[PDB]
Amino acid sequence: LSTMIGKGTGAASFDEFGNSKYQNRRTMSSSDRAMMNAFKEITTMADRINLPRNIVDRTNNLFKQVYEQKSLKGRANDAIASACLYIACRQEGVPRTFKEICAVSRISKKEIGRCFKLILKALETSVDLITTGDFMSRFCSNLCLPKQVQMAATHIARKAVELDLVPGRSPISVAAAAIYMASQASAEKRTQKEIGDIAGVADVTIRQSYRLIYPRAPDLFPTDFKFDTPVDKLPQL
C-alpha cells in the first residue's frame, strides 16, 4: 500500500499537555498481517537448519498458494508453514525427516505430517519418493566420518535395498544401520546411541536393522574398501 511516519524534528510536535509527540503511526495490513508472520516463522525455522534462500523462497511460495486457496484455513499457520518447509525440502531433492522439522518447529511431528498429506491433496499435486541416498551425506558428515566411510555406507545402503533385505523398513533406519556397520568397520567407531541421537530413530530400531543385515555383511561392502577389522571379527549387538 503506502507510507509511514515517525519522530518529530524535536520542535513543536504536540502531546500539548500529555506525552504524545504529534501522532502515532497506524497499522495497514491486519487482514494479511498473519501471512507476513507466517513468512517470519518460515525464515526463522529455515535458518535453524541453515537452508539456502532458494529453498526458503519455494517454501514461502507454496504457502502463499495454500493460503489463498483457503482450503486449510482451520489449522494453525505454524502447522501449515511446517508442512511447506517439509514439502519444499523434499521437492528440492534434499529431504529432511519429520523428526528434523519438528525439532525446529513448535508443531508436533504428528500434526506436520497430517497437514503434509492434506496439502498434497490441496494443491492437487504429488512428490518424489525418498531414497536412502538423500540422507547418507548429512549423517556421515556430522559424525566426522571420512569420505571413504560415507562412500561404503552409500554402497552398502544402496546394495541392501536392491537386494530387498529389508522388506518393510523406513529408509532412515536402514541408512542408520548401514552407517553403523560402516563405522564399526572403520577406525572412527561411533556408538549406536550417537547415531540414534542424530537420526531420531530408537537405538533398538538400529539394533534390529543391524541384526537383519549382519547375516549378509560380507557381500555388501564395495571392493575398493580396506578393512580395519575382519568381518569374522565384527562384533554383534
Binding site: 525427516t97 519429520f98 505430517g113 498429506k117 498434497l120 504429488s126 519418493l129 525418498i130 530387498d164 522388506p167 518393510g168 523398513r169 523406513s170 529408509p171 532412515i172
Partner: protein, 185 residues
C-alpha cells in the same frame, strides 16, 4: 468372473459400523446409573458406553437419543445388536425405537501371500497412491471407483475400508488385484 477366481480368495469382513436413532430425548445419567455392563464418563466424554457379550460388540448412546453400534462381523449381527441394545433401553422405561438403522462403514481384509513392489505402485499411481515410511509403515491407496480406501503392506496383507455394502469391497478388490499381481516380486 474369471478375473475374480485368481484373487478370489475373496476378502473377509472384520468390522462394520452402523448407526440407529431412538427418536427420543434420554437421561444418560439415569440410564448409565441403572444399566449393568455399562460405562459413563461425563467429565471426559458426553455419552454413555455399552457392551454386550454376544459377538463382542459395543454401542455408544447419545443424549439426543441417537446411538451408534459397532463390532458386528455381519449386517445380521448389526441388526441383532441394535435390537438387543434398543431392547434393554426399552427395558429402562424409555420409548426406544429401531428407526433409522443403517450401515455407515465396513472393513475388509485378505492375504494375497506374495512380496509386493511398492516404489513402482506409487510411481504408477502417484495421483492415487501415497507411501510414507516416516509416517506409517503401509501404502495408502485412495480408490475412486467405489470411492474406497486401501492399506497395502509389504507382507501381502491388505485392508480395505470406506464401504457401506459388500459389493464395493469385491469390486475394489477385483479392480486392484491385477495391478498387485503385476508388481509381484
Amino acid at each position: 468372473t474369471p478375473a475374480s477366481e485368481s484373487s478370489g480368495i475373496v476378502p473377509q469382513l472384520q468390522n462394520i459400523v452402523s448407526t440407529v436413532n431412538l427418536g427420543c430425548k434420554l437421561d444418560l445419567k439415569t440410564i448409565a446409573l441403572r444399566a449393568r455392563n455399562a460405562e459413563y464418563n461425563p467429565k471426559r466424554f458426553a455419552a454413555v458406553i455399552m457392551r454386550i457379550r454376544e459377538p463382542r460388540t459395543t454401542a455408544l448412546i447419545f443424549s439426543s437419543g441417537k446411538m451408534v453400534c459397532t463390532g458386528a462381523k455381519s449386517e445380521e449381527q448389526s441388526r441383532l445388536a441394535a435390537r438387543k441394545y434398543a431392547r434393554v433401553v426399552q427395558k429402562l422405561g424409555f420409548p426406544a425405537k429401531f428407526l433409522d438403522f443403517k450401515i455407515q462403514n465396513m472393513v475388509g481384509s485378505c492375504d494375497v501371500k506374495f512380496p509386493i513392489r511398492l516404489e513402482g505402485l506409487v510411481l504408477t499411481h502417484q495421483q492415487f497412491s501415497s507411501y510414507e515410511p516416516e509416517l506409517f509403515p503401509g501404502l495408502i491407496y485412495r480408490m475412486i471407483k467405489p470411492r474406497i480406501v486401501l492399506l497395502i503392506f509389504v507382507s501381502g496383507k491388505v485392508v480395505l475400508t470406506g464401504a457401506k455394502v459388500r459389493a464395493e469391497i469385491y469390486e475394489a478388490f477385483e479392480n486392484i488385484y491385477p495391478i498387485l499381481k503385476g508388481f509381484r516380486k
